[PDB]
Design a protein around this ligand. Structure first.
Ligand SMILES: CC(C)Nc1cc(Cl)nc2c(C#N)cnn12
Length: 290
Protein backbone atom coordinates (compact mmCIF):
# COMPACT_ATOMS: atom_id res chain seq x y z
CA UNK A 1 0.00 0.00 0.00
CA UNK A 2 1.41 3.30 -1.29
CA UNK A 3 0.33 5.20 1.82
CA UNK A 4 2.05 2.84 4.28
CA UNK A 5 5.62 2.01 5.09
CA UNK A 6 6.02 -1.41 6.74
CA UNK A 7 8.21 -1.43 9.83
CA UNK A 8 8.12 -5.08 10.82
CA UNK A 9 5.95 -8.15 10.95
CA UNK A 10 4.00 -8.24 14.19
CA UNK A 11 1.60 -11.09 13.80
CA UNK A 12 0.39 -13.82 11.57
CA UNK A 13 -3.30 -13.44 12.03
CA UNK A 14 -5.85 -16.06 11.16
CA UNK A 15 -6.45 -14.09 7.97
CA UNK A 16 -3.06 -12.71 6.94
CA UNK A 17 0.21 -11.05 7.98
CA UNK A 18 -0.04 -8.21 10.53
CA UNK A 19 2.55 -5.49 10.09
CA UNK A 20 3.56 -2.56 12.18
CA UNK A 21 3.48 0.28 9.63
CA UNK A 22 3.79 4.05 9.43
CA UNK A 23 1.50 6.40 7.52
CA UNK A 24 3.52 8.54 5.12
CA UNK A 25 1.53 11.76 5.62
CA UNK A 26 -0.17 11.79 9.02
CA UNK A 27 2.88 10.24 10.63
CA UNK A 28 0.54 7.70 12.28
CA UNK A 29 2.00 4.39 13.58
CA UNK A 30 -0.53 1.64 12.79
CA UNK A 31 -1.17 -2.10 12.71
CA UNK A 32 -1.74 -3.18 9.06
CA UNK A 33 -3.60 -6.45 8.44
CA UNK A 34 -3.47 -7.73 4.90
CA UNK A 35 -6.44 -9.89 4.10
CA UNK A 36 -6.87 -12.51 1.37
CA UNK A 37 -17.12 -10.89 -1.31
CA UNK A 38 -19.83 -8.22 -1.11
CA UNK A 39 -21.02 -9.31 2.31
CA UNK A 40 -17.52 -8.97 3.76
CA UNK A 41 -16.97 -5.33 2.88
CA UNK A 42 -20.43 -4.51 4.19
CA UNK A 43 -19.77 -6.20 7.54
CA UNK A 44 -16.31 -4.67 7.90
CA UNK A 45 -17.66 -1.17 7.14
CA UNK A 46 -20.03 -1.55 10.09
CA UNK A 47 -17.00 -2.34 12.28
CA UNK A 48 -15.84 1.24 11.66
CA UNK A 49 -18.68 2.61 13.81
CA UNK A 50 -18.29 0.10 16.61
CA UNK A 51 -16.03 2.35 18.67
CA UNK A 52 -15.07 1.66 22.29
CA UNK A 53 -11.96 2.45 24.47
CA UNK A 54 -11.52 -1.30 25.03
CA UNK A 55 -11.88 -2.22 21.34
CA UNK A 56 -8.74 -1.81 19.14
CA UNK A 57 -9.72 1.09 16.94
CA UNK A 58 -10.30 0.31 13.27
CA UNK A 59 -8.91 3.41 11.51
CA UNK A 60 -9.38 2.62 7.85
CA UNK A 61 -10.56 -0.05 5.44
CA UNK A 62 -8.69 -0.20 2.16
CA UNK A 63 -10.08 -2.19 -0.74
CA UNK A 64 -7.73 -2.15 -3.74
CA UNK A 65 -6.73 -4.49 -6.60
CA UNK A 66 -8.69 -7.24 -4.84
CA UNK A 67 -6.29 -6.91 -1.90
CA UNK A 68 -7.99 -5.94 1.40
CA UNK A 69 -6.21 -3.96 4.11
CA UNK A 70 -7.47 -3.11 7.58
CA UNK A 71 -5.72 -0.30 9.39
CA UNK A 72 -5.79 -0.57 13.16
CA UNK A 73 -4.68 1.43 16.18
CA UNK A 74 -1.28 -0.03 17.21
CA UNK A 75 -0.59 -1.56 20.62
CA UNK A 76 2.84 -2.49 21.91
CA UNK A 77 2.21 -5.79 23.64
CA UNK A 78 -0.35 -8.66 23.84
CA UNK A 79 -1.54 -10.61 26.84
CA UNK A 80 0.00 -13.91 25.78
CA UNK A 81 3.45 -12.67 26.10
CA UNK A 82 2.60 -10.42 28.96
CA UNK A 83 1.66 -13.65 30.70
CA UNK A 84 4.77 -15.45 29.42
CA UNK A 85 6.82 -12.53 30.83
CA UNK A 86 5.01 -12.79 34.19
CA UNK A 87 5.53 -16.58 34.47
CA UNK A 88 7.82 -16.46 37.54
CA UNK A 89 5.50 -14.39 39.72
CA UNK A 90 2.20 -14.18 37.82
CA UNK A 91 0.19 -11.05 37.04
CA UNK A 92 -0.78 -9.28 40.29
CA UNK A 93 -4.43 -9.85 41.18
CA UNK A 94 -5.51 -6.21 41.08
CA UNK A 95 -4.19 -6.05 37.49
CA UNK A 96 -5.98 -9.33 36.58
CA UNK A 97 -9.18 -7.74 37.83
CA UNK A 98 -8.66 -4.43 35.97
CA UNK A 99 -7.99 -6.37 32.76
CA UNK A 100 -11.05 -8.60 33.18
CA UNK A 101 -13.15 -5.60 34.10
CA UNK A 102 -12.11 -3.67 31.00
CA UNK A 103 -12.59 -6.65 28.67
CA UNK A 104 -16.11 -7.12 29.98
CA UNK A 105 -16.80 -3.47 29.25
CA UNK A 106 -15.60 -4.00 25.67
CA UNK A 107 -17.80 -7.07 25.45
CA UNK A 108 -20.92 -5.41 26.95
CA UNK A 109 -20.46 -2.70 24.26
CA UNK A 110 -20.12 -5.03 21.28
CA UNK A 111 -22.74 -7.45 22.50
CA UNK A 112 -25.25 -4.63 22.99
CA UNK A 113 -24.84 -3.95 19.28
CA UNK A 114 -25.12 -7.66 18.58
CA UNK A 115 -21.50 -8.05 17.46
CA UNK A 116 -19.71 -11.23 18.57
CA UNK A 117 -15.98 -11.73 18.68
CA UNK A 118 -16.03 -15.52 18.24
CA UNK A 119 -12.28 -16.13 18.69
CA UNK A 120 -10.97 -14.35 21.80
CA UNK A 121 -7.54 -15.48 22.97
CA UNK A 122 -4.54 -13.92 24.77
CA UNK A 123 -2.87 -13.18 21.44
CA UNK A 124 -5.64 -10.82 20.30
CA UNK A 125 -5.90 -8.98 23.61
CA UNK A 126 -3.66 -5.97 23.41
CA UNK A 127 -2.27 -3.83 26.20
CA UNK A 128 -0.65 -0.41 26.56
CA UNK A 129 1.59 1.33 29.11
CA UNK A 130 -1.47 3.12 30.45
CA UNK A 131 -2.92 0.01 32.11
CA UNK A 132 -5.54 -0.41 29.35
CA UNK A 133 -6.38 -3.66 27.54
CA UNK A 134 -8.27 -3.89 24.24
CA UNK A 135 -9.89 -6.65 22.10
CA UNK A 136 -8.39 -6.96 18.63
CA UNK A 137 -10.10 -8.67 15.58
CA UNK A 138 -13.57 -8.00 16.94
CA UNK A 139 -16.07 -8.93 14.23
CA UNK A 140 -13.74 -10.26 11.51
CA UNK A 141 -15.05 -13.80 12.12
CA UNK A 142 -18.60 -13.10 10.99
CA UNK A 143 -16.96 -11.24 8.04
CA UNK A 144 -14.48 -14.02 7.15
CA UNK A 145 -15.30 -17.15 9.21
CA UNK A 146 -12.81 -19.00 11.43
CA UNK A 147 -10.50 -21.41 9.49
CA UNK A 148 -8.97 -24.59 10.95
CA UNK A 149 -5.50 -23.31 10.04
CA UNK A 150 -4.24 -19.78 9.60
CA UNK A 151 -2.99 -18.61 6.17
CA UNK A 152 0.40 -19.96 7.28
CA UNK A 153 -1.12 -23.34 8.19
CA UNK A 154 -0.66 -22.63 11.90
CA UNK A 155 -3.47 -24.44 13.71
CA UNK A 156 -6.21 -22.16 15.03
CA UNK A 157 -6.14 -22.62 18.80
CA UNK A 158 -9.18 -24.38 20.26
CA UNK A 159 -8.27 -23.67 23.90
CA UNK A 160 -10.80 -20.91 24.26
CA UNK A 161 -13.59 -22.37 22.18
CA UNK A 162 -17.00 -22.49 23.86
CA UNK A 163 -18.57 -25.97 24.24
CA UNK A 164 -21.66 -25.16 22.12
CA UNK A 165 -19.32 -24.40 19.20
CA UNK A 166 -17.48 -27.69 19.73
CA UNK A 167 -20.76 -29.58 19.92
CA UNK A 168 -21.79 -28.16 16.49
CA UNK A 169 -24.30 -25.47 17.32
CA UNK A 170 -24.75 -23.24 14.25
CA UNK A 171 -26.43 -20.26 15.88
CA UNK A 172 -24.30 -19.67 18.98
CA UNK A 173 -24.67 -16.27 20.71
CA UNK A 174 -22.62 -13.61 22.53
CA UNK A 175 -22.18 -16.18 25.30
CA UNK A 176 -19.31 -17.72 23.40
CA UNK A 177 -17.16 -14.65 24.14
CA UNK A 178 -17.90 -14.87 27.94
CA UNK A 179 -16.70 -18.52 27.89
CA UNK A 180 -13.41 -17.63 26.17
CA UNK A 181 -12.82 -14.69 28.47
CA UNK A 182 -13.56 -17.03 31.41
CA UNK A 183 -10.93 -19.34 30.09
CA UNK A 184 -8.43 -16.45 29.88
CA UNK A 185 -9.20 -15.17 33.45
CA UNK A 186 -8.41 -18.68 34.82
CA UNK A 187 -5.25 -18.66 32.77
CA UNK A 188 -4.07 -15.27 34.11
CA UNK A 189 -4.72 -16.55 37.67
CA UNK A 190 -2.99 -19.91 37.44
CA UNK A 191 -0.28 -19.18 34.82
CA UNK A 192 -1.38 -22.20 32.74
CA UNK A 193 -3.99 -22.67 30.04
CA UNK A 194 -7.28 -23.90 31.46
CA UNK A 195 -8.15 -26.34 28.57
CA UNK A 196 -5.19 -26.70 26.16
CA UNK A 197 -6.80 -29.19 23.73
CA UNK A 198 -4.99 -30.42 20.67
CA UNK A 199 -7.98 -31.57 18.73
CA UNK A 200 -11.70 -30.90 18.92
CA UNK A 201 -12.35 -34.04 20.95
CA UNK A 202 -9.33 -33.48 23.19
CA UNK A 203 -10.70 -29.93 23.75
CA UNK A 204 -14.16 -31.16 24.59
CA UNK A 205 -12.82 -33.96 26.83
CA UNK A 206 -10.68 -31.46 28.69
CA UNK A 207 -13.68 -29.31 29.39
CA UNK A 208 -15.60 -32.43 30.44
CA UNK A 209 -12.81 -33.58 32.79
CA UNK A 210 -12.87 -30.27 34.63
CA UNK A 211 -16.54 -29.22 34.63
CA UNK A 212 -18.20 -32.64 34.41
CA UNK A 213 -19.60 -34.18 31.23
CA UNK A 214 -22.66 -32.07 30.49
CA UNK A 215 -26.13 -33.62 30.58
CA UNK A 216 -29.80 -32.62 30.33
CA UNK A 217 -29.79 -31.52 33.99
CA UNK A 218 -27.20 -28.73 33.68
CA UNK A 219 -27.64 -28.01 29.95
CA UNK A 220 -31.16 -28.61 28.68
CA UNK A 221 -30.97 -29.63 25.03
CA UNK A 222 -27.30 -30.69 25.16
CA UNK A 223 -28.03 -34.25 24.03
CA UNK A 224 -29.83 -32.90 20.89
CA UNK A 225 -26.79 -31.00 19.65
CA UNK A 226 -25.20 -32.07 16.31
CA UNK A 227 -21.82 -33.44 17.55
CA UNK A 228 -22.97 -34.66 20.97
CA UNK A 229 -22.50 -38.43 21.47
CA UNK A 230 -24.08 -40.68 24.17
CA UNK A 231 -20.79 -42.55 24.11
CA UNK A 232 -19.02 -39.48 25.64
CA UNK A 233 -17.27 -40.72 28.77
CA UNK A 234 -19.01 -39.42 31.88
CA UNK A 235 -16.57 -37.53 34.12
CA UNK A 236 -17.33 -35.84 37.45
CA UNK A 237 -17.07 -32.09 37.87
CA UNK A 238 -14.05 -30.80 39.87
CA UNK A 239 -14.44 -27.99 42.53
CA UNK A 240 -13.04 -24.61 41.42
CA UNK A 241 -11.02 -24.36 44.60
CA UNK A 242 -9.00 -27.10 42.82
CA UNK A 243 -9.13 -25.47 39.36
CA UNK A 244 -8.04 -21.92 40.15
CA UNK A 245 -6.34 -21.60 43.54
CA UNK A 246 -5.49 -18.93 45.01
CA UNK A 247 -8.40 -17.14 43.35
CA UNK A 248 -10.76 -15.87 46.11
CA UNK A 249 -14.44 -16.64 46.49
CA UNK A 250 -15.78 -13.69 44.50
CA UNK A 251 -13.42 -14.57 41.63
CA UNK A 252 -14.26 -18.26 41.78
CA UNK A 253 -17.95 -17.39 41.84
CA UNK A 254 -17.67 -15.11 38.80
CA UNK A 255 -15.57 -17.67 37.01
CA UNK A 256 -18.23 -20.40 37.45
CA UNK A 257 -20.81 -18.07 36.00
CA UNK A 258 -18.72 -17.36 32.96
CA UNK A 259 -18.20 -21.04 32.41
CA UNK A 260 -21.80 -22.23 32.71
CA UNK A 261 -22.41 -24.94 30.07
CA UNK A 262 -25.83 -23.55 29.20
CA UNK A 263 -25.15 -20.50 27.09
CA UNK A 264 -28.44 -18.92 28.30
CA UNK A 265 -27.38 -19.49 31.87
CA UNK A 266 -23.87 -18.19 31.25
CA UNK A 267 -23.43 -14.74 32.77
CA UNK A 268 -23.57 -11.81 30.36
CA UNK A 269 -20.85 -9.16 30.19
CA UNK A 270 -23.15 -6.45 31.57
CA UNK A 271 -24.16 -8.64 34.52
CA UNK A 272 -20.51 -9.68 35.04
CA UNK A 273 -19.67 -5.95 35.46
CA UNK A 274 -22.01 -5.84 38.49
CA UNK A 275 -20.50 -8.88 40.17
CA UNK A 276 -19.17 -8.21 43.65
CA UNK A 277 -15.69 -9.34 42.42
CA UNK A 278 -15.40 -5.83 40.95
CA UNK A 279 -16.46 -4.01 44.14
CA UNK A 280 -12.82 -3.04 44.74
CA UNK A 281 -11.59 -2.86 41.14
CA UNK A 282 -8.84 -0.30 40.38
CA UNK A 283 -6.67 0.59 37.36
CA UNK A 284 -3.07 -0.32 38.00
CA UNK A 285 -0.38 0.38 35.42
CA UNK A 286 1.68 -2.65 34.52
CA UNK A 287 5.38 -2.30 33.88
CA UNK A 288 6.16 -3.16 30.25
CA UNK A 289 9.62 -3.60 28.68
CA UNK A 290 9.54 -1.33 25.61
C1 LIG B 1 3.13 -5.11 18.91
C2 LIG B 1 1.94 -6.00 18.61
C3 LIG B 1 1.53 -6.83 19.82
N1 LIG B 1 0.81 -5.20 18.15
C4 LIG B 1 -0.28 -5.78 17.48
C5 LIG B 1 -0.28 -7.12 17.11
C6 LIG B 1 -1.42 -7.61 16.47
CL1 LIG B 1 -1.49 -9.26 15.97
N2 LIG B 1 -2.52 -6.89 16.21
C7 LIG B 1 -2.51 -5.60 16.56
C8 LIG B 1 -3.45 -4.60 16.42
C9 LIG B 1 -4.72 -4.77 15.82
N3 LIG B 1 -5.75 -4.91 15.34
C10 LIG B 1 -2.91 -3.47 17.00
N4 LIG B 1 -1.65 -3.72 17.49
N5 LIG B 1 -1.42 -5.03 17.18
Amino acid sequence: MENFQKVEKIGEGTYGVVYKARNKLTGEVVALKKIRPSTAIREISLLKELNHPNIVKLLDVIHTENKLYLVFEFLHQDLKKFMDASALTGIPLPLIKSYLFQLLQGLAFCHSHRVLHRDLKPQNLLINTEGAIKLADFGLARAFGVPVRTYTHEVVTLWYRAPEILLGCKYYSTAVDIWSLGCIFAEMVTRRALFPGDSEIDQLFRIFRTLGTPDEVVWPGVTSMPDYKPSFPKWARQDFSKVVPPLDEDGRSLLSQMLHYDPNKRISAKAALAHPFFQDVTKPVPHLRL
